[PDB]
Write a protein that binds this DNA or RNA. Structure first.
Length: 64
DNA sequence: GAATCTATGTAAATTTACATAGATTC
């Protein structure tokens, strides 16, 4: 696992550092579309858990 | 406070694209 995960991270990082502007823009656009649909399709339970995590993070940022 | 976007990790189909956590933007 560690040997696989380390090598996976190396491959990913290597791809990322060599991305063209266009490749990065595409990847980010796809991620923002993915997040937006996840947000659109959230259940009431998922929404509540998310808002609680976000308030926890905000409080944490506030304290440091 | 909450919407929105993104850096990071890695499950699943070497490379894609998913998924989470958390950072930014409003």
């Amino acid at each position: 696992r560690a040997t696989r995960l380390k090598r996976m991270s190396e491959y990913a990082a290597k791809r990322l550092s060599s991305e063209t502007r266009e490749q990065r823009a595409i990847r980010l656009a796809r991620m923002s579309a993915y997040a937006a649909r996840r947000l659109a399709n959230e259940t009431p339970a998922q929404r509540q858990a998310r808002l609680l995590r976000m308030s926890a993070y905000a409080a944490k940022r506030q304290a440091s």
